[PDB]
Amino acid sequence: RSSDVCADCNGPDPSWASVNRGTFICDECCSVHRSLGRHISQVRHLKHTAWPPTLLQMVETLYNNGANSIWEHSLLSIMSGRRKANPQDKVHPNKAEFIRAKYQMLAFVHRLPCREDDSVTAKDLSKQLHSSVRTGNLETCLRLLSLGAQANFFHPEKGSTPLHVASKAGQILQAELLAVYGADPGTQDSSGKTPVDYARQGGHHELAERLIEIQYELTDRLAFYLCGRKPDHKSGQHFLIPQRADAALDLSELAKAAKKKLQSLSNHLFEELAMDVYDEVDRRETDAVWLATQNHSTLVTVVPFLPVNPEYSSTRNQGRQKLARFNAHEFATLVIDILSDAKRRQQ
Amino acid sequence: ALEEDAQILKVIEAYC
Ligand SMILES: [Zn+2]
């Protein structure tokens, strides 16, 4: 029912999804989404590539069961200065101002997400999630999370994360939603076991296979960006180091120096760098899907580098945007060295 | 954060 229309303008027949928001949107509204940055909206075209079946099932289930009502709660007190956009509204400023108010400013939500320093409310909301996830209500879970529930939260008394619970219950859409808000399939409970483990123990094998795909999402995406293939996780090899183009020539001295510098980063900083490279990959990839889906009109009429994430420093953001300066060969070199060392660091 | 971010930024500059 809800799938027929854009969540942001009511425009018919939408082509993109905002995965973290569980909404389908049209092209125009997407073009504004892409400018907000992944920390606000994570965009993916619905028909251009195959999705993991259960990731798309999750987004479409969420949107058909009141996801948009969390984000538009205030509207549902109706005033003349706060009006939802209509399909024929100009992208600038009509649709844009609305979308930024919907998702960036969180203008229409029932209650804003608690401040990060709010330990007691964060804990309460998080214990609700860690219970709620056992059942199959995705709307409650998105609601809790929007309020500031933490998906990788560790229950001090029960000894487990929401992802453990969903996994032992076979709640795969829940697992999927939680992983979007960065739940970790590799986190051990107090008894030393991963959500992957609870899945297999429960006889939920596709979910187990899916959790492992989620574990390796970052490196899988980097490998695909250069090969058009991903590791075969059922085979047991979990990485895929693409070959460099200059493979017939000896490695140059600055290339060796660059990689030395990269290996020098602590695991924590390295994983931060890889998220950055992940984001740029996702940008360069979406750029091409954009040009492949858009009509000649819309294009010949966003941003040429990663959007600013306000929760990052000006330095972090500068490095992230510096990634757009990389030419194909430079970028491929960074991606290959990040892949071969993600592997090094895990053995 | 800044001491962490500055390490990342210098790795990135090494690849460009
Ligand atoms: Zn729209």
mmCIF file of C-alpha atoms in Angstrom, chain A residues 40-190:
data_model
loop_
_atom_site.group_PDB
_atom_site.id
_atom_site.type_symbol
_atom_site.label_atom_id
_atom_site.label_comp_id
_atom_site.label_asym_id
_atom_site.label_seq_id
_atom_site.Cartn_x
_atom_site.Cartn_y
_atom_site.Cartn_z
ATOM 1 C CA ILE A 40 21.389 11.170 7.835
ATOM 2 C CA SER A 41 20.130 8.999 4.984
ATOM 3 C CA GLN A 42 21.530 5.879 3.345
ATOM 4 C CA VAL A 43 20.380 5.677 -0.230
ATOM 5 C CA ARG A 44 19.989 2.669 -2.524
ATOM 6 C CA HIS A 45 18.219 2.231 -5.851
ATOM 7 C CA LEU A 46 15.519 -0.468 -5.687
ATOM 8 C CA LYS A 47 15.693 -2.048 -9.125
ATOM 9 C CA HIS A 48 19.183 -1.340 -10.463
ATOM 10 C CA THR A 49 20.983 -4.073 -8.554
ATOM 11 C CA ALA A 50 19.722 -7.119 -6.675
ATOM 12 C CA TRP A 51 19.570 -6.543 -2.937
ATOM 13 C CA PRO A 52 20.158 -9.104 -0.272
ATOM 14 C CA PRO A 53 16.579 -10.380 -0.285
ATOM 15 C CA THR A 54 16.094 -9.884 3.422
ATOM 16 C CA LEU A 55 17.501 -6.325 3.502
ATOM 17 C CA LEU A 56 14.935 -5.183 0.907
ATOM 18 C CA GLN A 57 12.238 -7.188 2.662
ATOM 19 C CA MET A 58 13.070 -5.240 5.826
ATOM 20 C CA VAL A 59 12.864 -1.772 4.265
ATOM 21 C CA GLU A 60 9.613 -2.499 2.407
ATOM 22 C CA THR A 61 8.035 -4.043 5.541
ATOM 23 C CA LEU A 62 9.038 -1.056 7.661
ATOM 24 C CA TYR A 63 7.595 1.485 5.170
ATOM 25 C CA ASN A 64 4.285 -0.343 4.793
ATOM 26 C CA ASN A 65 3.863 -0.333 8.584
ATOM 27 C CA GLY A 66 4.201 3.293 9.594
ATOM 28 C CA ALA A 67 7.894 4.142 9.317
ATOM 29 C CA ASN A 68 6.908 7.501 7.735
ATOM 30 C CA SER A 69 4.579 8.137 10.699
ATOM 31 C CA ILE A 70 7.558 8.293 13.043
ATOM 32 C CA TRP A 71 9.154 10.943 10.903
ATOM 33 C CA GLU A 72 5.952 12.826 10.206
ATOM 34 C CA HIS A 73 4.265 12.425 13.626
ATOM 35 C CA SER A 74 3.636 16.150 14.213
ATOM 36 C CA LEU A 75 1.959 16.507 10.798
ATOM 37 C CA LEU A 76 -0.472 13.695 11.606
ATOM 38 C CA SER A 77 -1.857 20.944 15.100
ATOM 39 C CA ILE A 78 -1.710 21.081 11.283
ATOM 40 C CA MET A 79 -0.418 24.582 10.415
ATOM 41 C CA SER A 80 0.077 26.578 7.190
ATOM 42 C CA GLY A 81 3.842 27.101 7.552
ATOM 43 C CA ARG A 82 4.622 23.405 8.047
ATOM 44 C CA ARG A 83 3.200 21.665 4.971
ATOM 45 C CA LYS A 84 4.393 18.366 3.492
ATOM 46 C CA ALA A 85 5.599 18.692 -0.136
ATOM 47 C CA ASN A 86 3.420 17.686 -3.130
ATOM 48 C CA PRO A 87 4.643 15.846 -6.270
ATOM 49 C CA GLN A 88 4.684 18.946 -8.468
ATOM 50 C CA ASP A 89 6.513 21.113 -5.881
ATOM 51 C CA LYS A 90 9.870 22.573 -6.985
ATOM 52 C CA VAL A 91 12.896 20.602 -5.792
ATOM 53 C CA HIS A 92 14.426 23.878 -4.599
ATOM 54 C CA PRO A 93 13.421 25.150 -2.174
ATOM 55 C CA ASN A 94 10.056 23.376 -1.588
ATOM 56 C CA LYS A 95 10.936 19.683 -1.534
ATOM 57 C CA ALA A 96 14.443 20.342 -0.205
ATOM 58 C CA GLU A 97 13.447 22.487 2.792
ATOM 59 C CA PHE A 98 10.863 19.832 3.715
ATOM 60 C CA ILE A 99 13.201 16.832 3.428
ATOM 61 C CA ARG A 100 15.875 18.633 5.525
ATOM 62 C CA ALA A 101 13.214 19.407 8.097
ATOM 63 C CA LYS A 102 11.969 15.815 8.020
ATOM 64 C CA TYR A 103 15.255 14.045 8.480
ATOM 65 C CA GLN A 104 18.044 16.500 9.286
ATOM 66 C CA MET A 105 16.197 18.721 11.769
ATOM 67 C CA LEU A 106 13.793 15.946 12.905
ATOM 68 C CA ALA A 107 11.079 18.578 12.926
ATOM 69 C CA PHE A 108 8.056 16.367 13.020
ATOM 70 C CA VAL A 109 8.937 13.568 15.407
ATOM 71 C CA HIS A 110 6.921 12.858 18.573
ATOM 72 C CA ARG A 111 10.021 13.335 20.769
ATOM 73 C CA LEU A 112 13.661 14.086 19.809
ATOM 74 C CA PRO A 113 16.491 11.552 20.370
ATOM 75 C CA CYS A 114 18.096 11.818 23.829
ATOM 76 C CA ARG A 115 21.466 13.599 24.156
ATOM 77 C CA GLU A 116 24.448 11.221 24.012
ATOM 78 C CA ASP A 117 25.339 12.059 27.641
ATOM 79 C CA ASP A 118 21.874 10.873 28.770
ATOM 80 C CA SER A 119 22.943 7.567 30.340
ATOM 81 C CA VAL A 120 19.655 6.671 32.137
ATOM 82 C CA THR A 121 17.201 7.232 29.240
ATOM 83 C CA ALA A 122 19.597 5.647 26.737
ATOM 84 C CA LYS A 123 19.793 2.609 29.037
ATOM 85 C CA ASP A 124 15.999 2.397 29.446
ATOM 86 C CA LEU A 125 15.264 2.728 25.699
ATOM 87 C CA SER A 126 18.015 0.203 24.995
ATOM 88 C CA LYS A 127 16.572 -2.387 27.405
ATOM 89 C CA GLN A 128 13.174 -1.932 25.663
ATOM 90 C CA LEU A 129 14.816 -2.655 22.297
ATOM 91 C CA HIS A 130 16.647 -5.692 23.699
ATOM 92 C CA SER A 131 13.231 -7.049 24.732
ATOM 93 C CA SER A 132 11.162 -5.761 21.791
ATOM 94 C CA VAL A 133 13.471 -7.388 19.229
ATOM 95 C CA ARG A 134 12.432 -10.915 20.295
ATOM 96 C CA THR A 135 9.019 -10.167 18.701
ATOM 97 C CA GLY A 136 8.476 -9.129 15.094
ATOM 98 C CA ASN A 137 7.413 -5.485 15.359
ATOM 99 C CA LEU A 138 9.868 -3.552 13.205
ATOM 100 C CA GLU A 139 8.028 -0.252 13.822
ATOM 101 C CA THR A 140 8.660 -0.407 17.568
ATOM 102 C CA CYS A 141 12.314 -1.055 16.938
ATOM 103 C CA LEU A 142 12.749 1.785 14.491
ATOM 104 C CA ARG A 143 10.809 3.976 16.957
ATOM 105 C CA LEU A 144 13.057 3.016 19.885
ATOM 106 C CA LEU A 145 16.192 3.564 17.760
ATOM 107 C CA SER A 146 14.982 6.952 16.549
ATOM 108 C CA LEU A 147 14.598 7.860 20.215
ATOM 109 C CA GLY A 148 18.219 6.944 20.865
ATOM 110 C CA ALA A 149 18.169 3.231 21.665
ATOM 111 C CA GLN A 150 21.538 1.657 20.914
ATOM 112 C CA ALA A 151 21.649 -1.397 18.656
ATOM 113 C CA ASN A 152 25.039 -2.622 19.854
ATOM 114 C CA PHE A 153 23.970 -2.143 23.493
ATOM 115 C CA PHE A 154 25.179 -4.789 25.950
ATOM 116 C CA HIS A 155 22.636 -5.829 28.598
ATOM 117 C CA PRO A 156 24.488 -5.682 31.933
ATOM 118 C CA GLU A 157 22.186 -8.293 33.492
ATOM 119 C CA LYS A 158 21.127 -10.516 30.568
ATOM 120 C CA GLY A 159 24.638 -10.521 29.116
ATOM 121 C CA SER A 160 23.704 -10.052 25.451
ATOM 122 C CA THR A 161 22.985 -7.539 22.677
ATOM 123 C CA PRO A 162 19.724 -6.994 20.753
ATOM 124 C CA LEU A 163 21.361 -8.718 17.782
ATOM 125 C CA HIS A 164 21.897 -11.877 19.887
ATOM 126 C CA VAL A 165 18.227 -11.835 20.805
ATOM 127 C CA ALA A 166 16.913 -11.358 17.288
ATOM 128 C CA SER A 167 19.240 -14.090 16.069
ATOM 129 C CA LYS A 168 18.213 -16.692 18.659
ATOM 130 C CA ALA A 169 14.574 -15.871 17.856
ATOM 131 C CA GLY A 170 15.156 -16.200 14.110
ATOM 132 C CA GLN A 171 13.921 -12.615 13.656
ATOM 133 C CA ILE A 172 15.862 -11.944 10.463
ATOM 134 C CA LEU A 173 14.182 -8.613 9.543
ATOM 135 C CA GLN A 174 15.032 -7.457 13.060
ATOM 136 C CA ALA A 175 18.617 -8.581 12.523
ATOM 137 C CA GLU A 176 18.620 -6.708 9.277
ATOM 138 C CA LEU A 177 17.259 -3.504 10.839
ATOM 139 C CA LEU A 178 19.726 -3.718 13.748
ATOM 140 C CA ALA A 179 22.745 -4.262 11.474
ATOM 141 C CA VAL A 180 21.747 -1.039 9.595
ATOM 142 C CA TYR A 181 22.102 0.832 12.860
ATOM 143 C CA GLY A 182 25.487 -0.874 13.090
ATOM 144 C CA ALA A 183 24.888 -3.950 15.237
ATOM 145 C CA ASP A 184 27.881 -6.247 15.301
ATOM 146 C CA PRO A 185 27.485 -9.933 14.342
ATOM 147 C CA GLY A 186 30.895 -10.641 15.853
ATOM 148 C CA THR A 187 30.193 -9.476 19.401
ATOM 149 C CA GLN A 188 30.349 -12.220 22.026
ATOM 150 C CA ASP A 189 27.817 -12.579 24.827
ATOM 151 C CA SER A 190 28.827 -13.313 28.442
#
